[PDB]
């Protein structure tokens, strides 16, 4: 009964931060990815991402700010090949080819996956319901899509989302020119998921705040009308439903707080699930709707629509993205 | 990199002044 003492501390509910068995993997990996990220974001040398001997600077010390700074994806010459430090002849080679990128995202994806499992674990230790982790699967799948799934389908981690602000934008623009993600019903569900999420978040927030029962005066915060762990609900759902039920019509409003809150969880999670699958499916080149030259007049002339205008914009990104990496007329990789 | 010479002072004041305002308010609250 010595190994039992270790197990008890790991699964202990009296730790300021819960460890858990998922955390046994999570803590080292996240620390590894974080430490490498901070160092690479600041002091890493330029990286030849497109594998054409054209190194791209991403760190602060090499002429970047917070906005333009990034950890650059591994070389296209590498592709999907596993590229740890011990596979390089030297750290100089490893840094030139985008080594840090693979080290970080792999430790991160592992750590993040264990983070989700860690959420189930504590909920089990506390006697909760375990589906909060299911909600976290929505952003986790999104990260898996741009860091792992899309590089797989395309055949290189060089086409993975860079660890940077501007690099992120670069990922979005090139993506649109090749997949027409805007005209894809899954990104559109994602937009509806995050716009609706923000809407409903603002909505739920305003209705509960509006129906707060007076417990305070004008010379103090209304927040002090609530005490942590009190038996009574701080607001009046009856009044709140009375308002929103008249703003539209009563049958368009929720009188059930459990049913209401479930909707609050369901809508943005499901929405993000789809846009996650959007990237994941467009990774295998099942692209957005193509209505280029769909409208034709009697003679045969092409009558342009807004889709054709979108196409012209996509042409602009396509012919310019990675201006030196193409030797043949069709962009496949 | 040839950056703005006022970037340093503008960023420093943008942090310091409102953060000091908060710190001042906090310490006089715990003392109450």
């Amino acid at each position: 009964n010595l190994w039992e003492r270790f197990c008890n501390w790991v699964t202990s509910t009296d730790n300021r931060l819960y460890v858990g068995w998922f955390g046994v993997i999570m803590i080292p990996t996240l620390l590894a990815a974080t430490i490498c990220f901070v160092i690479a974001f600041i002091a890493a040398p330029p990286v030849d991402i497109d594998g054409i001997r054209e190194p791209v600077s991403g760190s602060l010390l090499y002429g970047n700010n917070i906005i333009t700074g990034a950890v650059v994806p591994s070389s296209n010459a590498i592709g999907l090949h596993f590229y740890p430090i011990w596979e390089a002849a030297s750290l100089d080679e490893w840094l030139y080819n985008g080594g840090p990128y693979q080290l970080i995202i792999f430790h991160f994806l592992l750590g993040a996956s264990c983070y989700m499992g860690r959420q189930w674990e504590l909920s089990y230790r506390l006697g909760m319901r375990p589906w909060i982790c299911v909600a976290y699967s929505a952003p986790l799948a999104s990260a898996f899509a741009v860091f792992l799934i899309y590089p797989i389908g395309q055949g290189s981690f060089s086409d993975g989302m860079p660890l940077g602000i501007s690099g992120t934008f670069n990922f979005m623009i090139v993506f649109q020119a090749e997949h027409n993600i805007l005209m894809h019903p899954f990104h559109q569900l994602g937009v509806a998921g995050v716009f609706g999420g923000a809407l409903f978040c603002a909505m739920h927030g305003s209705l509960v705040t509006s129906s707060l029962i007076r417990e305070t005066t004008e010379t103090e915060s209304a927040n002090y009308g609530y005490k942590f762990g009190q038996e009574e609900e701080t607001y009046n759902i009856v009044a709140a439903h009375g308002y929103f039920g008249r703003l539209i019509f009563q049958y368009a409003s929720f009188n059930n707080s459990r049913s209401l809150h479930f909707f609050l969880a369901a809508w943005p999670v499901v929405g993000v699930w789809f846009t996650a699958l959007g990237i994941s499916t467009m990774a295998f080149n099942l692209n957005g709707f193509n209505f280029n030259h769909s409208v034709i007049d009697a003679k045969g002339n092409v009558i342009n629509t807004w889709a054709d205008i979108i196409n012209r914009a996509n042409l602009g990104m396509e012919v310019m993205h990675e201006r030196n990496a193409h030797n043949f007329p069709l962009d496949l990789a | 990199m040839e950056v703005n010479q006022l970037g340093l002072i503008a960023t420093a004041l943008f942090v310091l002044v409102p953060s000091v305002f908060l710190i001042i308010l906090y310490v006089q609250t715990e003392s109450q």
């Binding site: 300021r16 931060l17 600041i42 602060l60 942590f228 | 340093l8 960023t11 942090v15």
Partner: peptide, 29 residues
């Protein structure tokens, strides 16, 4: 000097995390 400024702010944020977690205002029932 730009780098030093960027890192300094980032450092302060990480420090703030430590105090907001381990030296937070303890919630009481």
């Amino acid at each position: 000097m730009e780098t030093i400024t960027y890192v300094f702010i980032f450092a302060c944020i990480i420090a703030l995390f430590f105090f907001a977690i381990f030296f937070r205002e303890p919630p009481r029932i």
